[PDB]
Amino acid sequence: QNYGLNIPITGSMDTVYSNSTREEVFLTSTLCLYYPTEASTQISDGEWKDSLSQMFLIKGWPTGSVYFKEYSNIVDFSVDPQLYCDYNLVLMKYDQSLELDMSELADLILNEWLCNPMDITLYYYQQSGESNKWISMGSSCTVKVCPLNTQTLGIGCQTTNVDSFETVAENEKLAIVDVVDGINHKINLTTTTCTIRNCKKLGPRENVAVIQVGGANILDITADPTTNPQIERMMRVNWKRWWQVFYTIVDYINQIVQVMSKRSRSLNSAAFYYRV
Amino acid sequence: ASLIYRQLLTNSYSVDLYDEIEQIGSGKTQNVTINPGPFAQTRYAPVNWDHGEINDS
Ligand SMILES: *[C@@H]1O[C@H](CO)[C@@H](O)[C@H](O)[C@H]1NC(C)=O
Ligand SMILES: *[C@@H]1O[C@H](CO)[C@@H](O)[C@H](O)[C@H]1NC(C)=O
Ligand SMILES: [Ca+2]
Ligand SMILES: [Ca+2]
Ligand SMILES: [Ca+2]
Ligand SMILES: [Ca+2]
């Protein structure tokens, strides 16, 4: 245990495999499911928590090791979603006009974000590169950004007139805003009800997987227009009955966990880098 | 003295008899499994108070 340093490992390409770890991942981890309240509404039952738990036990997950966490809806769940858990699954009923909100939430939760504060009232901010964004979270975020010259004079906006400022996000719970990189900006965001953080994009967060229950592939986690990839952890499924959705989850839970993996930053291996 | 472990493994079948004994010894209870579905509490009725049946003549 030699934390912190980046030491080069070495391995032989002729060694053999080892015994499967399926038993361990069932018997030690904790599965964790987030669903919308309309799920329980359509279920209209209420020992169904116990029913699902026992089905999970048949699949191999001990009784106390599977957690359920109802959330109201996508927009109100995206406001600081804390996945303090071990193997996270997030169901999302796709609906029209929530494409960007759902994609923002997926981008927020499926990747490790390193966030520093932002004192809007005092400093003028910047974006180091493509890996930097500003995530605003609150009850009502209305980010108004005014870019600046090299001499601290606004362009397309006056530094004193929030009317002249340009609106980039308006009255949404979660706003992962990007702007031009290398241009100082002056922000105004309603500080009493919407915090904002200057965040950097680390590697991917394998701990959580997203399940779009509704329509077609839309989730563009990569803010770059060019690349719109399809990650293994962005799963999609059709549906008419929430019972059928949950039974599919339980039946294929081993495959879902195979798609996912333990958080890289939750381990002692990542102790002195950005462990959390 | 290595045969202690061999003997315990070989004779382990007697723990079934021991389990039967402790089962006979132990007192027992059971459940009356609870009902779900009090999802609709019910009020009395629309009730209005009035004087009874006056006995006129
Ligand atoms: C690996 O699994 C096989 C059967 O699945 C078992 O016989 C073997 O003992 C296991 N390996 C070890 C080191 O126990
Ligand atoms: C944003 O603009 C409003 C006026 O619309 C102003 O009252 C408020 O102080 C501004 N926010 C900040 C952080 O300066
Ligand atoms: Ca303007
Ligand atoms: Ca949003
Ligand atoms: Ca940028
Ligand atoms: Ca993209």
UniProtKB/TrEMBL annotation, chain A:
GPR motif: region residues: 203-205
Domain of life: Viruses
Sites where the protein binds Ca(2+) 1: D45, E47, G156, S164, E166
Binding site for Ca(2+) 3: Q127, D178, D181, D251
Glycosylation sites: N19, N188
Signal peptide: none
Note: In group A rotaviruses, VP7 defines the G serotype.
Role this protein plays: Rotavirus attachment and entry into the host cell probably involves multiple sequential contacts between the outer capsid proteins VP4 and VP7, and the cell receptors. Calcium-binding protein that interacts with rotavirus cell receptors once the initial attachment by VP4 has been achieved. Rotavirus attachment and entry into the host cell probably involves multiple sequential contacts between the outer capsid proteins VP4 and VP7, and the cell receptors. Following entry into the host cell, low intracellular or intravesicular Ca(2+) concentration probably causes the calcium-stabilized VP7 trimers to dissociate from the virion. This step is probably necessary for the membrane-disrupting entry step and the release of VP4, which is locked onto the virion by VP7.
Name listed for the protein in its UniProt record: Outer capsid glycoprotein VP7
Whole-protein residues included: 51 to 326 of 326
TrEMBL record, chain B:
Location relative to the cell: Virion
Domain of life: Viruses
Protein name (database record): Outer capsid protein VP8*
Species of the source: Rotavirus A
Gene: VP4
Residue span relative to the full protein: 2 to 58 of 775
